[PDB]
Design a protein around this ligand. Structure first.
Ligand code: HEM
Ligand code: 0GV
Length: 423
């Protein structure tokens, strides 16, 4: 049931008049239409203004300027003195009731951002990730083995059985979340980054119920670790002193929520889109499987470029900015479309070819660099690598058998369900 594709094919041309970045219906279209829309913007309207989507649109606040060029997204990322992460990194205004749960370091500027990031950043270094490499592989090995055992007919949903669980288990392990609570945590983060998709929720009170629930989970776990320290990130949070003063319970909960949402709702889509690409372009599977360790570094970078799991991130101007002939005003919202930068014809020879040997590969799936560069980048790369190594070893012919069920989202390039089959 997988539709045939030809590597290197550009999307059909999308007329400039047909693009509505502010409509839910646009984000419901398939990737060819979306990719073609962003190609048209790069060529004919590389900076342009759009209204918020209608999803909770009455409280969204103002519209935004869309940056579609790799170099413009780079400039914005590298100059937070102009393009601020405060007050929010999605288009929607962060209302007071949302700020209760989501006013974390990701919506702060330096120096407070850096002081918060430094509490945990040593647990995400390459050498620390190398320590828990063996744990990461054991968890991936066991999940892939369970897929074979749980599905003797050789068919299953890659997302529920592997792509979701592996990153979930790792970040829960690093936070010190008990094994019995994994499913509950994943349900909550699925809803928090699925608002607007009816398979997740379209009811904002249910969203607020979930946010309440994970916030209360976080504070209860932090309260236990304050009494009895463990060697986990939650204990690092309760123990930290920023200029002699400890974090508030509110600050601890927001930080906890940031880490588990980010760890649960990103890598899984790199894996699902990676499987889809290897299914559509079998020469690339054949190349990688023939020399997994020789090709893994370039293959992992190309999977992130192809998937762009985070579609965009917002910034806010503190001064007037005249960029590429477009005059934007102090206080305007500006959006950084990584999904577009990662197809930029000025930065990639042959952007429409999925090439697991690609080098160089200046992909900005982890953002354009700078102060908020993805804290989990090293971890995510290892998570992707070990999952595909275990699929290669245990079920080398695993392939998608249907087009995926796509998450309805402007922010997250989500695959909800991906049927696969193996011999
Ligand atoms: C392939 C997987 C992932 C992708 C594509 C991705 C993408 C991103 C992007 C685009 C940003 C914003 C960068 C910027 O503003 O310049 C970000 C920030 C962040 N990510 Fe990742 N992410 C991934 C996996 C993870 C994982 C597994 C974690 C584990 C906890 C994580 C934790 C974070 C955190 C904490 C931040 C905020 C950093 C800060 O504000 O200083 N991410 N991520
Ligand atoms: C992908 C990761 C790297 C980052 C995750 C960030 C998470 C923890 C946080 C940071 C800011 C939060 C959003 C917000 O402030 C406003 C709204 C509007 C509301 O109508 C629906 C929910 C939404 C999109 C929030 C969803 C959760 C977000 C993205």
């Amino acid at each position: 049931g997988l539709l045939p594709r030809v590597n290197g094919t550009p999307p059909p041309e999308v007329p400039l008049a047909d693009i509505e970045l502010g409509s839910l219906e646009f984000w419901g279209r398939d990737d060819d239409f979306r990719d073609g829309a962003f190609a048209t913007l790069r060529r004919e309207a590389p900076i342009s203004f759009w209204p918020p989507i209608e999803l909770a649109g009455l409280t969204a606040g103002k519209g935004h300027w869309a940056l579609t060029k790799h170099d413009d997204i780079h400039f914005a990322s590298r100059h937070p003195e102009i393009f601020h992460s405060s007050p929010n990194i999605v288009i929607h205004d962060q209302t007071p009731e949302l700020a209760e749960y989501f006013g974390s370091m990701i919506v702060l500027d330096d120096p407070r951002h850096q002081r918060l990031r430094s509490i945990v950043s040593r647990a995400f270094t390459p050498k620390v990730v190398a320590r828990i490499e063996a744990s990461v592989r054991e968890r991936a090995h066991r999940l892939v083995a369970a897929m074979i055992e749980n599905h003797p007919d050789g068919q299953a949903d890659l997302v529920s059985e592997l792509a979701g669980p592996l990153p979930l288990q790792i970040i829960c392990d690093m936070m010190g979340i008990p094994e019995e609570d994994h499913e509950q945590i994943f349900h909550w983060t699925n809803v928090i980054l699925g608002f607007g998709d009816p398979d997740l929720t379209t009811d904002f009170d249910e969203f607020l119920q979930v946010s309440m629930a994970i916030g209360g989970y976080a504070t209860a776990l932090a309260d236990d670790r304050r009494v009895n320290h463990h060697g986990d990130l939650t204990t690092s949070l309760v123990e930290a002193e920023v200029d002699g003063e400890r974090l508030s319970s509110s600050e601890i909960a927001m930080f906890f929520i940031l880490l588990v949402v980010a760890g649960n709702e990103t890598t899984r889509n790199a894996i699902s889109h990676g499987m889809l690409a290897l299914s559509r372009y079998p020469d690339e599977r054949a190349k990688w499987w023939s020399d997994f360790d020789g090709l893994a570094a370039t293959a992992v970078e190309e999977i992130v470029r192809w998937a762009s799991p985070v579609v965009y991130m917002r910034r806010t101007l503190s001064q007037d900015v005249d960029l590429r002939g477009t005059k934007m005003a102090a206080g305007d919202k500006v959006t950084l479309w990584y999904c577009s930068a990662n197809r930029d014809e000025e930065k990639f020879a042959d952007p429409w070819t999925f090439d697991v040997t690609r080098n160089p590969n200046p992909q900005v799936g982890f953002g354009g660099g700078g102060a908020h560069f993805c804290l989990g980048a090293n971890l995510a790369r290892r998570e992707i690598r070990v999952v595909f190594d275990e699929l290669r070893r245990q079920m080398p012919d695993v392939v998608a058998t249907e087009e995926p069920a796509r998450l309805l989202s402007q922010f997250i390039h989500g695959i909800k369900r991906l049927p696969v089959a193996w011999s």
